[PDB]
Amino acid sequence: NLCPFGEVFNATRFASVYAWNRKRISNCVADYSVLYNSASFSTFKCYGVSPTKLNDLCFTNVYADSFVIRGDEVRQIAPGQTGKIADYNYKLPDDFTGCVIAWNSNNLDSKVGGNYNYLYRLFRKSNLKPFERDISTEIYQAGSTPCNGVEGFNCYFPLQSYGFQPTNGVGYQPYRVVVLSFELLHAPATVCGP
């Protein structure tokens, strides 16, 4: 019956931005008014649709992209943006339809001993295509000479950690970001609001 929005937004451990989980939501009724009017969300920005028409609208598929980014990087999850995350970790298409949802997760992800589990891609040969998922751990070739699998000068580990601390400012706190992508195609609109 009801769509499993609760599982996506209450998951105990979220994924890293570089490898972002893709869940397709179908064959259920989607209640949006519980999320929209919640007092636990910090960001709720919709692109291409109006924030209140979601209940009326019917879509073929809803895709929930769940990734952890740093506070200052929340503004990069939008169409037509650049940056370390926007270009190398998670790229949105220019004709994006959906809502970008984010909330402060400082009391859940940050550790006093240092949270290093979260990672982000720092070096890539080229920028990502929309909804491209790059999970390669291949050594970055900065120069014209081969690395041969060994690090050092001009051969670096492409991933980098965040290092979340409880004493950091708001701009460096972890924030969980769920992106609900609305895809419509020539199929019955099995997803519809109440």
């Epitope: 900065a142 081969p146 050092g152 670096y156 980098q160």
Partner: antibody, heavy 121, light 107 residues
Framework: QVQLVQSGPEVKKPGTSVKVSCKAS????????VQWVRQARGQRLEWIGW????????NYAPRFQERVTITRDMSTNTAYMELSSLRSEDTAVYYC????????????????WGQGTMVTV | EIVLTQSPGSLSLSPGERATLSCRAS???????LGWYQQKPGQAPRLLIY???SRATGIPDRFSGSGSETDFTLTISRLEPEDFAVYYC?????????FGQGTKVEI
Amino acid sequence: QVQLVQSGPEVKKPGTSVKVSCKASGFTFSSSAVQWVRQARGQRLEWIGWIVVGSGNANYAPRFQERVTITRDMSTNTAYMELSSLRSEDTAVYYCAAPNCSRTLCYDGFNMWGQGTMVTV
Amino acid sequence: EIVLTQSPGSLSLSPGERATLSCRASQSVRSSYLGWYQQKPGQAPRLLIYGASSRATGIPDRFSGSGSETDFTLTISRLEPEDFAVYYCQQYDSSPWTFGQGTKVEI
């Protein structure tokens, strides 16, 4: 005109800690990495340690590993090096050098060098 | 610690003839991860070659390099008056990146 402009010379008493920095301009600093070397007057060059500014991973030579903290500030395109417990023999000219790095690709050698700063203890 | 032996310590040679400089490594070093620097007196060093045999930009054709696993050689075809300086080799293969003793070329 890709250069690396550091600060001027300093003369400090023994036991204090000195802060040295190099400010990059004209090229993409984040892709590149900075190596720190020192050369006393009339002697050879000694390698303090290098840092990749983008990653922030700092490697230090074994002799000076305990006493050097090599940090970077990406916002101002500046690499910092700090020496503690300055002893009389530590007086030397300190250099910083980074490869000319474009966004897509980097130069295989350490092309750009600094002007050199004298530190007297 | 990869000690870089340098021979000879000093070199006295007239301009116009050939010169052979030697950078000796304690153990084998990757050819690509090496560079040569010219330090003029009272000046910063300046890179001439990288990867043993690949000349860097802005250096004339006279300077040349020979590559091998444990032997590295720099050769100057024609000595010029401004080319008399202390030359240093560096290995980027393994940390620490040591420097050689330095060979001074004079007349």
